[PDB]
């Protein structure tokens, strides 16, 4: 399958070089997998989700995404136009309020919820979780992300937008999950993107067009935008039977575009998420 005039991030995921405009992907498109988007919620009614999205848990007064961030990330995971895995099932877990902030105990609770809630969903190809959030280092937040990964969920987390080493940020610094940095359309590390040895992979994170609340769309930047690319890719690769949840992190790093990124500090991996599609 080929999506012409796709967002640059999708085209980047399916190409060894930057500057392309077509997203090439296998028609399976992550069908049979599921991705928990743990953020501000998902506007499941957005036509781009085609009814494949739904809220499963909120830790606030409404399950409604009043911010737009969670809808944007869910769109990059699996919306029709802006999604990596265009047939994956999206589950929204609203651990962040409509101002985009959420207490650590709430984020931990949402991760524990996903670890249990997946046991009553039909996700034969596997389960992914996209955590486009984070703050300062927390051993308990890291432990919660590790538990979610240990429970059999491919956990992708944002490295953070501090232009610092991700070692001081959670859940970015938890080793067992896949920590995602951000790159721009010219194969540079995004100016804001965190780095460090804890990073596993880079994804398109600068000027990412995706869904927004109110049935609209908008382009925003952040490692929070790179994370759903990697999670959508994991759901895409798991549906293809190429990897499992416990190994998708290394498989994606195994098959990434190597050395293509600039301004990667020494000690940070130079790997760009890549689906290695050929047809």
Residues annotated as binding site for Ca(2+)? 16, 175, 177, 200, 260
CB of 193 to Ca ion, least distance (A): 16
CB of 253 to Ca ion, least distance (A): 9
Collect all residues with Cβ–Cβ distance below 8 Å to 107 and sequence separation of at least 6. 38, 95, 96, 131, 133, 141, 144
**Per the residue annotation, which of 39, 97, 98, 184 is the catalytic one?**
39
CB of 198 to Ca ion, least distance (A): 6
Known catalytic membership, residue 46: no
> Which pair of tokens denotes residue 209?
């067009």
Which residue numbers belong to the known binding site?
16, 175, 177, 200, 260
Q: Of the listed pieces 30-38, 105-113, 192-200, 214-222, which binds Ca ion according to CB under 5 A?
A: 192-200
- Considering the candidates 46, 69, 72, 229, report the single residue annotated as catalytic: 69
Contacts for 231 with CB less than 8 Å, ≥ 6 apart: 35, 77, 84, 128, 129, 130, 154, 156
CB nearer to Ca ion: give 42 or 231: 231
> Which range, of 71-79, 104-112, 196-204, 255-263, touches Ca ion by CB under 5 A?
196-204
Under rule CB under 5 A, residue 187 binds Ca ion: no
The count of residues interacting with Ca ion (CB under 5 A) is 1
Number of residues that make up the chain: 279
Half-sphere exposure of 175 (CA within 13 A, CB side): 1
Among 172, 200, 225, 273, binds Ca ion (CB under 5 A): 200
First to last CA, the chain: 8
* DSSP H helices in the chain: 8-13, 69-78, 104-117, 139-150, 223-239, 248-254
Of residues 98 and 200, the one with the C-beta less far from Ca ion: 200
The whole-angstrom separation of Cα 256 and Cα 260 is 10
Nearer to Ca ion, 3 or 142 (CB): 142
Residue 170 catalytic? no
Bridge partner list, 131 = 157
**Are the C-beta atoms of residues 268 and 202 closer than 8 Å to each other?**
no
In the complex with Ca ion, the residue whose CB is nearer, 184 or 200, is 200
Interaction pattern, residues 145-184, with Ca ion; x per rule: CB under 5 A: ----------------------------------------
Structure-token pair, residue 6: 């796709």
> DSSP code of 242?
S
Catalytic positions are 39, 69, 224
Residues that bind Ca ion (CB under 5 A): 200
């Amino acid at each position: 399958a080929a999506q012409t005039n796709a967002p640059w991030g999708l085209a980047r995921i399916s190409s060894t070089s930057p500057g392309t405009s077509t997203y090439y992907y296998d028609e399976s498109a992550g069908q049979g997998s599921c991705v928990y988007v743990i953020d501000t919620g998902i506007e499941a009614s957005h036509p781009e989700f085609e009814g494949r999205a739904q809220m499963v848990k909120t830790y606030y007064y409404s399950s409604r995404d009043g911010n737009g961030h969670g809808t944007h990330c869910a769109g990059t995971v699996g919306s029709r136009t802006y999604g990596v895995a265009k047939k994956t099932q999206l589950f929204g877990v609203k651990v962040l309020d409509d101002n985009g902030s959420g207490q650590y105990s709430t984020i931990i609770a949402g991760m524990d919820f996903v670890a249990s809630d997946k046991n009553n969903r039909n996700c034969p190809k596997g389960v992914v979780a996209s955590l486009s959030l984070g703050g300062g280092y927390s051993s308990s937040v890291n432990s919660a992300a590790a538990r979610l990964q240990s429970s059999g969920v491919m956990v992708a987390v944002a490295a953070g937008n501090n232009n610092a080493d991700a070692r001081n940020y959670s859940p970015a610094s938890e080793p067992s999950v896949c920590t995602v940095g951000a790159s721009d359309r010219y194969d540079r590390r995004s100016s804001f993107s965190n780095y460090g040895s804890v990073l596993d992979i880079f994804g398109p994170g600068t000027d990412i067009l995706s869904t927004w609340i109110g049935g609209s769309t908008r382009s925003i930047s952040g490692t929070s935008m790179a994370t759903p690319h990697v999670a959508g890719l994991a759901a895409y690769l798991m549906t293809l039977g190429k990897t499992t949840a416990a190994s998708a992190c290394r498989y994606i790093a195994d098959t990434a575009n190597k050395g293509d990124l600039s301004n990667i500090p020494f000690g940070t991996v130079n790997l760009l998420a890549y689906n290695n599609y050929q047809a």
